[PDB]
RNA sequence: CUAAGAGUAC
């Protein structure tokens, strides 16, 4: 795994979050919220887990990282904090 | 075969949003979604459990953490159930639930888009008119299927990846796959004509019908001696602010003598009759611009607003069609008959030349093939000329002409066949063959190559077909039906093979495929 | 089967004009249009109700009753 | 199977009222009144009588769906004029006109000898 | 008495037939509404059609004005009239069929063909005369 | 509020086209030889014949007082005073094009809700027109 | 023999409509036809992309295959984005 | 002062009149109310004791529910939904009974004159089936072969045509305005000349024809409607119009009442 | 109005569909395709009744 | 369906007061869309409507035999003799407001068949129910409370959407999910697992 | 019932991809209905007198 | 269970 892990200083993937990454991040976070995970943002009365996760993503309080797998087996770790959600 | 699925007949609903689907109440009571009990939703889940499974909205099951499943039928005997955090309430699907919606001959992705539930009190699935084009679905008895996601991850990705607004522009040909169709498409053309003026009482109702109307009455195009609004001016309310579109048709200038073309500045229609080229599923049109400038949600809202206002105006204006729309006046019918007779005379002259062997064969084919090619070309151009005469005769108040002009339904060939001349009947790309010995029917003599002998139908549908023309037309129609039945199976097989071949191709993170 | 009680379209009672219609066709030798006009059926919605009726009940009555008392 | 009962077209349901008024935030001095178990019959009449009023700036109605018997009527009047008062005046005018019509028809019918 | 004859497809190869007696047997201002017909410019006929409309079958003989229609539409109606609901027999009350569908008030067509009174369609109709408007009324 | 433009024109042609309520007219100014007008007019609501002398005015507002529409249109109360009282036919529209016809001639395009107007003349008297909303007032 | 009309850049700059004579042939003998003097060997084309592949190469065969698929797709006037057929 | 009425024809079952000095909305609302808002009596529940006929039980029930019944005093009856009885009582229903036997060797026609009112009417004028033809036999309900019997009991409640069309008293209502098309509310379809191809209405005799040279009158509104109300027979034709006006007035008054009662809370 | 023409087998009404076939004792000549070594075939489906 | 291949389902039902009406108070039993007419070219539908209108007015029976000498012109002349517009158009009024419709409506009697396909024989939904004995998958058919086939090309469409987890949930959690114990040395399911 | 009692079937495969047996032949004039065929895989193969 | 047939929407 030491050989597989591309060091953070020379990642060569896009800094933008893909549509599939955003969809899975929202799904995963909404599923965790539905199972009584602690919330990292203040709620303004919303009760839907999906929109709670959307609010968490809007201000980047989701503590997950994407492990993007290159076709050779190597991977790059991009935190949700540093991924630019342009879409 | 999977669970949590429904199937039933579909009906259209102009009063539904683009991404909504109307779900029958009994179907909504049968299908359920399991919702995890959370401090944020304990009260409403408790209320649904109290309501029970026999009335909507309500819950059908309670899945305890121990795995035991409390059936809400026969559970009222035990009394009220106290819910604990971490339990599951398997409850009826309510409004605004993401559901996958499919029509079975599913040939591309846009035939499996995701809708929002709207519970309705009847036995048919209800969907917007515009979304029927990607589904290739009519309302002549079509059935469609419904799949309910059963977890938060599937629900989230179904709403964020497969939603109807996200599929407006398709990758298949980089242009929108949904547009304005049929009645709305015809009413939008009738409404935006320069003649169309609206009085105050109807303007207020049309403005109120637009859900996102900002609440200001636009100044009328005409102020004295009577306040009148134009159709373009009221339709412009639906169009979002900040949209520019400029298309130049054939012969249009900056002034539009024919009112063709299209100029929209800042969401206001400066000029141009709105028709298929603007609000259809065409590249560079209004739908494409709005969805590439404001986002898919605003475009779906545009679909809804346009449909609502145009349907209201057309409801209170009216549109019909009848037998009188297929009738051309006397001189036009005289000219059509003259054209047909002249073309028949030309065919007779060519036949006379061919029978005298004075005809010279085209380089690359036999004499008979050249003769048949000439005859077919003459007859086809005859039918086209007669149809053009008939189309020119038709007035602007003609209903079939109006539908063709809007692009909603019909074509020039339909007008030609209904009014002027049905034309030349062909089987296997050739004229009607000699099924009998040297003749098509036992009512003709041997070796008859005349247009009427080998399947030219010089009568229109209005005038009616003679028995021989009727039989030849039946032969042509049978050929068409057989071709359709073969083509559907062949395309299905080819599509399966192609999909199996390419299923594993994917774009990776280094941009390679 | 048997004459409908009311016109489908407008709701005019036409169920009592059947035997009179048959009598006019038979006894008075009137044609269908004059007979319909004589009974007061002026809208073509009612005229199609009476004119196109097929009285199948007679065929049913030709069979012997299942339960005869 | 799924067909709703016909009496739901006119009988008020349990827990709902004939009228409900909501202030409109789009424009000043504007309200939206929801009429329950009503249809075009009342809506068109009320709309026309309101438009006859001189201090009513805006009056419109819509039946959002044919399935359900209810409609929404938006009213905006000039400043210092309660939209509820405009609705009251419209209803009063409608009632007076209908009463005069009934009286006139009765008087005209009583003059018939071939009836 | 030798007034009519039976001909099969083999013998039909060697005969000349007249479509209608009036327009083709006797040696030949016209209504412009009438369809265009030809005299065939030949007099050596051996037989005559009893009626052209007898080329149609049982299901197609119900269609009104089939010659003003596109042919696939006629095929569709011929296939779809067998699914029409009506009275299949008058003794349905004494039969235990697996499934039976009956109209309350079958009505004979206002527009009827001559060949449908040999099919007993007026006696056992399978539809009703509805007042139809062709209009874009409400968008539904 | 003030008249941005005012002139007297003589109508040389009225073209109904394919419409029944709208006609396109061409008019030549009777004072300036370089100013000409093309205009769509609702003839049902304001009949116009050829060889008719029309006073045409373009204004930025209708109120008699000078400028101190964003406010929603309101039906005219009794006693309201506006410039339209002096004219017979008032339209409201937006300018959508300014064109340099020549060294001195310029053209301005207006659209009143789909009714098109093109006004052409030298810049010495059409300079008041600018890219905004305007009222067109016509009297006979 | 047919008369076609192509777009040739004029010496003054524009693309003008220039007509040419083009030979259509039933049957394929690409290897022998290509070497016939008087023709343009570069521009010769064939419907049979197998012959194109076995005479010109795998890349030219791929180009001919794409062109044939595109002709099929656009025969009825439909338009498909390039990348799918590619 | 207000809406004016002048009636051309008065008959037993038709009334033809002119409704002038009134808005289009008011006339259309009155027409709609006459169509589907006037209460009427009609058979609602059927108990079939014996049926050996050739018709199905619900077939005969559907036919019976469509039989018009007298509804002159229907305002005195109460709806079954707002009555304190269990299922049906004398204060909210009328009980009829049909009992026919095929004792004749020929076919016996069961008409609606054979319906017998069983429950006491307490002096009201409701319940009796409407008889119109000269023979005296009402609607032909059924037919009986020899040896066939039909015994049944009907309960009739009051209802409006919105709940079911069997409670409608109004038949077809003719409604027209502006016969000369002076308001230009229609654009006439035509081939050569729209005046020749469109037949003139019978009401054109009651208005002045257009002068064919005058300009279009853009200030003219729609009034002076021509209407014709037909009666099925449940209530007299004049009562149809009068009760329609009354019902519309009641609806508007109920709107006022709800507004005032929620204003005081 | 029943026309008959059907059987009743185990209480079920069964109808025999007409079956189309090539006529017998007729000499038919057919051309054959290029790959086959025979060019034309003349055949008779002889049958005795 | 009419007798000319014009099949269709009921979109909605309106009461009499809401349907459009002619000046004689006649309301239609059916309303069909104009757009069904031009592309399908069923002119016989319109001709038969006109003939049926004339026949209902005059009391005769309409001869709609195929190859007779009956023209639209003669039918229109007969209709005009009855006091109606010869081409079958009528001035209709909007049912909601009473105002005249700007367009005149083609209107008349036409023969319709009720087909055997009704919605109540086709509506079907299933959350959970009987399973097949062999494959432990839902049974087939609405008569057995079965489940809908999630075919191959449906799976391909869902792949194209990119929704992996929804496809997995469809194929496992909704149809048949079975837990099995496997060895580590060998990959076979020959593991005796006494869970108790 | 009538159309069923007058039905003829041609036993060619029904899955075969040849279209000539299904086409309406000229000799069918007056013997089988020109437009009364099933519309699926039995189009033209199933005929009516 | 198997086999067969009639279909509905493409
Ligand atoms: Mg369909
Ligand atoms: Zn009627
Ligand atoms: Zn009671
Ligand atoms: Zn092992």
PDB file of C-alpha atoms in Angstrom, chain B residues 464-471, chain E residues 19-20 35 37 51-56 65-68 113, chain J residues 63-70, chain K residues 29 34:
ATOM      1  CA  UNK B 464     -62.193   7.611 -52.407  1.00  0.00           C
ATOM      2  CA  UNK B 465     -60.355   4.729 -54.034  1.00  0.00           C
ATOM      3  CA  UNK B 466     -61.556   2.462 -56.826  1.00  0.00           C
ATOM      4  CA  UNK B 467     -61.369  -1.287 -56.077  1.00  0.00           C
ATOM      5  CA  UNK B 468     -58.126  -1.832 -58.000  1.00  0.00           C
ATOM      6  CA  UNK B 469     -56.495   1.184 -56.347  1.00  0.00           C
ATOM      7  CA  UNK B 470     -57.824  -0.101 -53.018  1.00  0.00           C
ATOM      8  CA  UNK B 471     -56.197  -3.501 -53.542  1.00  0.00           C
TER       9      UNK B 471
ATOM     10  CA  UNK E  19     -65.419  -4.554 -62.135  1.00  0.00           C
ATOM     11  CA  UNK E  20     -68.965  -3.191 -62.381  1.00  0.00           C
ATOM     12  CA  UNK E  35     -63.724   9.630 -57.844  1.00  0.00           C
ATOM     13  CA  UNK E  37     -62.716   5.930 -62.965  1.00  0.00           C
ATOM     14  CA  UNK E  51     -69.776  -6.609 -56.254  1.00  0.00           C
ATOM     15  CA  UNK E  52     -66.244  -5.344 -55.545  1.00  0.00           C
ATOM     16  CA  UNK E  53     -67.019  -4.942 -51.831  1.00  0.00           C
ATOM     17  CA  UNK E  54     -67.111  -8.744 -51.617  1.00  0.00           C
ATOM     18  CA  UNK E  55     -63.308  -8.835 -51.660  1.00  0.00           C
ATOM     19  CA  UNK E  56     -63.413  -7.889 -47.966  1.00  0.00           C
ATOM     20  CA  UNK E  65     -65.941   3.942 -46.048  1.00  0.00           C
ATOM     21  CA  UNK E  66     -62.827   1.714 -45.955  1.00  0.00           C
ATOM     22  CA  UNK E  67     -61.730   3.149 -49.317  1.00  0.00           C
ATOM     23  CA  UNK E  68     -61.284   6.624 -47.793  1.00  0.00           C
ATOM     24  CA  UNK E 113     -72.624  -0.990 -44.923  1.00  0.00           C
TER      25      UNK E 113
ATOM     26  CA  UNK J  63     -74.997   3.846 -46.603  1.00  0.00           C
ATOM     27  CA  UNK J  64     -71.257   3.765 -45.921  1.00  0.00           C
ATOM     28  CA  UNK J  65     -70.501   0.874 -48.272  1.00  0.00           C
ATOM     29  CA  UNK J  66     -67.002   1.136 -49.783  1.00  0.00           C
ATOM     30  CA  UNK J  67     -67.376   1.445 -53.561  1.00  0.00           C
ATOM     31  CA  UNK J  68     -70.708   3.255 -53.884  1.00  0.00           C
ATOM     32  CA  UNK J  69     -71.268   6.662 -55.491  1.00  0.00           C
ATOM     33  CA  UNK J  70     -71.664   8.529 -52.185  1.00  0.00           C
TER      34      UNK J  70
ATOM     35  CA  UNK K  29     -57.939 -11.008 -54.972  1.00  0.00           C
ATOM     36  CA  UNK K  34     -56.849  -7.834 -48.350  1.00  0.00           C
TER      37      UNK K  34
END
